[PDB]
Enzyme design. Structure first.
Site, PDB file in Angstrom:
ATOM      1  N   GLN A  79       0.815  -1.205   0.000  1.00  0.00           N
ATOM      2  CA  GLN A  79       0.000   0.000   0.000  1.00  0.00           C
ATOM      3  C   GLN A  79       0.852   1.259   0.000  1.00  0.00           C
ATOM      4  OE1 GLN A  79      -1.552  -1.136   4.083  1.00  0.00           O
ATOM      5  NE2 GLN A  79      -1.757   1.087   4.189  1.00  0.00           N
TER       6      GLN A  79
ATOM      7  N   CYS B 247      -5.205   0.533   3.755  1.00  0.00           N
ATOM      8  CA  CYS B 247      -5.248  -0.858   4.196  1.00  0.00           C
ATOM      9  C   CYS B 247      -6.658  -1.440   4.096  1.00  0.00           C
ATOM     10  CB  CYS B 247      -4.735  -0.945   5.631  1.00  0.00           C
ATOM     11  SG  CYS B 247      -5.764   0.021   6.766  1.00  0.00           S
TER      12      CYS B 247
ATOM     13  N   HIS C 160      -5.299  -1.087  11.632  1.00  0.00           N
ATOM     14  CA  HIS C 160      -4.728  -1.571  10.381  1.00  0.00           C
ATOM     15  C   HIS C 160      -5.566  -2.729   9.879  1.00  0.00           C
ATOM     16  CE1 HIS C 160      -1.922  -2.097   7.204  1.00  0.00           C
ATOM     17  NE2 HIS C 160      -1.506  -3.283   7.611  1.00  0.00           N
TER      18      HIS C 160
ATOM     19  N   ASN D 265      -0.915  -9.340   4.638  1.00  0.00           N
ATOM     20  CA  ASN D 265      -0.710  -7.923   4.857  1.00  0.00           C
ATOM     21  C   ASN D 265      -0.509  -7.257   3.503  1.00  0.00           C
ATOM     22  OD1 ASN D 265      -0.444  -5.549   6.235  1.00  0.00           O
ATOM     23  ND2 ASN D 265       1.464  -6.078   7.292  1.00  0.00           N
TER      24      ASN D 265
HETATM   25  C1  LIG Z   1      -5.034   1.608   7.249  1.00  0.00           C
HETATM   26  C2  LIG Z   1      -3.493   1.718   7.293  1.00  0.00           C
HETATM   27  O1  LIG Z   1      -2.929   2.184   6.258  1.00  0.00           O
HETATM   28  O2  LIG Z   1      -2.886   1.342   8.301  1.00  0.00           O
HETATM   29  C3  LIG Z   1      -5.790   2.903   7.609  1.00  0.00           C
HETATM   30  O3  LIG Z   1      -5.032   3.721   8.476  1.00  0.00           O
HETATM   31  C4  LIG Z   1      -7.220   2.604   8.105  1.00  0.00           C
HETATM   32  O4  LIG Z   1      -8.123   2.327   7.320  1.00  0.00           O
HETATM   33  N1  LIG Z   1      -7.434   2.650   9.427  1.00  0.00           N
HETATM   34  C5  LIG Z   1      -8.750   2.372   9.975  1.00  0.00           C
HETATM   35  C6  LIG Z   1      -8.662   1.449  11.172  1.00  0.00           C
HETATM   36  C7  LIG Z   1      -8.784  -0.017  10.785  1.00  0.00           C
HETATM   37  C8  LIG Z   1      -9.728  -0.221   9.596  1.00  0.00           C
HETATM   38  C9  LIG Z   1      -9.261  -0.757  12.032  1.00  0.00           C
HETATM   39  C10 LIG Z   1      -9.396   3.677  10.420  1.00  0.00           C
HETATM   40  O5  LIG Z   1      -8.715   4.546  10.947  1.00  0.00           O
HETATM   41  N2  LIG Z   1     -10.711   3.770  10.193  1.00  0.00           N
HETATM   42  C11 LIG Z   1     -11.488   4.934  10.546  1.00  0.00           C
HETATM   43  C12 LIG Z   1     -11.524   5.976   9.432  1.00  0.00           C
HETATM   44  C13 LIG Z   1     -10.190   6.661   9.141  1.00  0.00           C
HETATM   45  C14 LIG Z   1      -9.817   7.703  10.199  1.00  0.00           C
HETATM   46  N3  LIG Z   1     -10.762   8.810  10.245  1.00  0.00           N
HETATM   47  C15 LIG Z   1     -10.859   9.770   9.320  1.00  0.00           C
HETATM   48  N4  LIG Z   1     -11.755  10.736   9.427  1.00  0.00           N
HETATM   49  N5  LIG Z   1     -10.044   9.761   8.253  1.00  0.00           N
END
Ligand SMILES: *C(C(=O)O)[C@H](O)C(=O)N[C@@H](CC(C)C)C(=O)NCCCCNC(N)=[NH2+]
Length: 212
Positions: free
Chosen positions: A19, A25, A159, A175
């Site tokens: 990525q 992710c 993640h 991953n």
């Molecule tokens: C994935 C990565 O590259 O590590 C990425 O950070 C991600 O999708 N994180 C998710 C958490 C997982 C799916 C548990 C996440 O943070 N989801 C919530 C939305 C993103 C954060 N909030 C905003 N407003 N961007």
């Protein structure tokens, strides 16, 4: 369900991706589950577009993160393009599904694994690759080179990855950090510890696509 599952051996898992710096992710995990369920149902292994989900899943936030459930519901509501028609650029752009011709594949819905339940997640994996989340922020996980990973890690999941198999003591995770991390891009994460959260919170939030 059997003692061992490994969707790579059944030909349902595409090559490991990277990525990059983009927080995509959630899109890679969803795509892993789409490639898997399409192989299981149709016999064809195709690569699908993480970029399409990154651009077009409005419930998610592009490279600032997102929700695997939103991406899977996006593929069930509309569909998804092949990776070659809609390749990965590592940055969120305009949604181009409309201009890339008909969708390559489409699913029929998205079910959730009962959270905090190891056996429920194993049952899911025996049927298809499953989108799962975990805590990847710890240096212990970041530097993982191989073996059955036991941590250290907490449950502050951050993640999205994909469970593509399991064994008597582990869950096999694809991953999205390129083929040079871990076991050629995979990690085997300890299971059976009795921690309801799972190692690194692995049981926090698990989804899989449905295809009739
Ligand atoms: C994935 C990565 O590259 O590590 C990425 O950070 C991600 O999708 N994180 C998710 C958490 C997982 C799916 C548990 C996440 O943070 N989801 C919530 C939305 C993103 C954060 N909030 C905003 N407003 N961007």
């Amino acid at each position: 369900i059997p003692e061992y599952v490994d969707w790579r051996q059944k030909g349902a898992v595409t090559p490991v991706k990277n990525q990059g710096s983009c927080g995509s992710c959630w899109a890679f995990s969803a795509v892993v589950t789409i490639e898997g369920i399409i192989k299981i149902r149709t016999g064809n292994l195709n690569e699908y577009s993480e970029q399409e989900l990154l651009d077009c899943d409005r419930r998610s936030y592009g490279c600032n993160g997102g929700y695997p459930w939103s991406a899977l519901q996006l593929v069930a509501q509309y569909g998804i393009h092949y990776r070659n028609t809609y390749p990965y650029e590592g940055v969120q752009r305009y949604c181009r599904s409309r201009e890339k011709g008909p969708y390559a594949a489409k699913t029929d819905g998205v079910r959730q694994v009962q959270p905090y339940n190891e056996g429920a997640l194993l049952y899911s994996i025996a049927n298809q690759p499953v989108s799962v989340v975990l805590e990847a922020a710890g240096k212990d996980f970041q530097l993982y080179r191989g073996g059955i990973f036991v941590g250290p890690c907490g449950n502050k999941v951050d993640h999205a990855v994909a469970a593509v198999g399991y064994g008597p003591n582990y869950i096999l995770i694809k991953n999205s950090w390129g083929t040079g991390w871990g076991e050629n891009g995979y990690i085997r994460i300890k299971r059976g510890t009795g921690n309801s959260y799972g190692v690194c919170g692995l049981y926090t939030s698990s989804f899989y696509p449905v295809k009739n």
